[PDB]
Amino acid sequence: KVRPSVKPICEKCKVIRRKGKVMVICENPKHKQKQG
Amino acid sequence: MLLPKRVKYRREHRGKMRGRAKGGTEVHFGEFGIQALEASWITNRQIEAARIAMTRYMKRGGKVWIKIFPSKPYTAKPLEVRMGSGKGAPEGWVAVVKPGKVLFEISGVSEEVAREALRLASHKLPIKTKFVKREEIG
Amino acid sequence: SFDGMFTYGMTHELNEKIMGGRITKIHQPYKHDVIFHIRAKGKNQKLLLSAHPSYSRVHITAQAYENPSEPPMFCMLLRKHIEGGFIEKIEQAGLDRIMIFHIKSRNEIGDETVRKLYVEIMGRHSNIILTDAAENVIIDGLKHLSPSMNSYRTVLPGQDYKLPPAQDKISPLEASEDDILRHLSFQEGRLDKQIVDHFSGVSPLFAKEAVHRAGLANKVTLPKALLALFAEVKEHRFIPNITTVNGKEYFYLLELTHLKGEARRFDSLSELLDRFYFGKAERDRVKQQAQDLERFVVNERKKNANKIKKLEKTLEYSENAKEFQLYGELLTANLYMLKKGDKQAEVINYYDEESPTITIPLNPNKTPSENAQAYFTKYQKAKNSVAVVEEQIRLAQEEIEYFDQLIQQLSSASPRDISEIREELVEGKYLRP
Amino acid sequence: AAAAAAA
RNA sequence: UGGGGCGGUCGCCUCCUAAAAGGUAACGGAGGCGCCCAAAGGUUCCCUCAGAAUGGUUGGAAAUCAUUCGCAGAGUGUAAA
RNA sequence: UUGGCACCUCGAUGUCGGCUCAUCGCAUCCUGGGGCUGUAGUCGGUCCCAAGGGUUGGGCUGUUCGCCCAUUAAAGCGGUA
RNA sequence: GGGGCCUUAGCUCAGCUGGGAGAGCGCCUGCUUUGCACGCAGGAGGUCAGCGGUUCGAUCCCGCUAGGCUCCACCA
Question: Which of residues 64-103 of C touch strand G (CB under 7 A)?
Fold first, then answer.
């Protein structure tokens, strides 16, 4: 999901900054968030 | 939903919002509160939305002190008419809020419950907000 | 009740009491009751013309019908057209329940034009219609009827009168000692109903009284009774009384030999209709409660008995779902055995062979564990049903005991006992305050 | 109006 | 006259807008006046208002009367300062 | 789009709908490549990257629009007085 | 675009400015009626169009829905 409010949904979510873009990766694929 | 049931005049000037808060700057009823950082008119609909958003998440706890009151009315001319020909009818009520003013006051709950309730209130308000607490020098 | 014979006696009494006279005041205090203030010879009279759906009557009342409210438009047209005039004669249209009032009323412009006021007492088809007695068009009616609703005999202002339908009978009075029997044709025993639908204007009460005066009903032990009762009706030999057996009342102009219990002898029909009845109200209350309450209690008892039988059906479905849980637990390890029914699947060793006996439906299915899990859920619902349906059976027998008691207490007793039963019920339960 | 009907 | 029309207004007085002299606009926001009083005018001599409580018989929250607390919460013909 | 103002034109800036010819931007209708799906497969839903190409014949009404008939991979929104 | 009142029993629709949803018509049950489809009582319907706030109870108070019927929109 692409939203400008990338936030950790659960405790397993990890905030990363690939390619100058704030992203959240997680073991659950529904929690994958990107902005920009 | 808050409005005065009687006013001296139904149409008033819009005023100016220069300077800091004249009063209501320090938290002195509850333990935690919201301090305003920017100045804009706060509609009583927004006040009601923030109050329900705090009260729902604080289903068990103390009461909410609403430090602001929408005493100033604003007039709204009807749509699709020419300019002038008299001032329009009053539509709603707003509260003139200056930076530094305390908006809502909470006591009788935990720290994180109060912080999350104030965050949920602040996401309904049109101004930048911050978390403040009582200081005891004193 | 009510009938052409009682109508004939009423016309005779009104001809005896109010002949000529002057109608000083016309009042309509209720929706169906019309009061005529007749100033006849001697003192004043109060004639009542009632067109109630169940309590319609014509008699000279004596009590004060209070609350004179703002009069409706039929009463105003009656005061415009009838007041100030005289009554010529009161006669009956044959033997049917039709009352004809001949009003010699002066018109409002000064001249005289006779008016005919028609009073029909047919229960729920009762009406009061005034005509101008020359063209016989309806000036006004007490109940206004449309060309669609009650298409025959339309009652509108200005429309021509149509006159009530013919019942296709013979005149019962001064008929013949032979005509009366050459047409009833008794074959299998519908005697009272044959008298009702073969004679003009006769109530079933007079038929049931006549079949008791005949004694043993035969070919000749019946027409002499009818001629004897018609001779009692004629020559004006009426004996008005009130008779009842239990609570609900009856009235007639002749003494009743059948259906005994009370006598309450009267003098004239005016005091008879004044005493019975006013009009309903207590009699209409015990009419609206009596059979409806016991019907409701008996129907609810039948509901509760059917409920107990269908709860015992669920009590057998309990053991059926216990067998289903056994068969699901049989399936659960399964398919140890083949899918089909997974019957008798057990491990020979290192198994706790429950090996319960089971009835084997074919074993489902696409989702092999959720079928056994569905069986196990049905079992949990079954045991919760074992609790709740036993509670409902207990409540249903309590309700049947209370309703059988209510049937007993309605099937007669006291009056004062019924009063305090009402009191106790309303106490039982608080109940907004 | 503004009808182009020049003659 | 935020085109003209339709609506509304046209003279005088009071407040705000008016930015701590005066003045200052808009089809800006609020109201009144086209009078009244032979006295409510002039002079002289006296006095101080409205509301709360207590007590009172017809007085109950209030008709009329005594007391305190009363720098004006009254009145000043008519309306704002 | 409907509006607001009246800056340009009243010694003229022709105004709707159609026909002909087009061009441009994606906030993409299809086709192409993907993520998440409460995506079993077909068909789907939502959100990305993508303008290369194509995006219909009628009945009604001056009509744009709209409704209906029959198709289609789809019968996309707008700007260019 | 601007304003009004409702949206409640299969139907017509009350309910007074918050004190606990009802009348008429429809459908059944029982009584009664000699007879002409003329009478009586007793039952069910409603989340009061819908949604969450207030207070001890909300058709009533409030916003936004969703409708109906209101009563008009001077132009090129």
Answer: 95-97
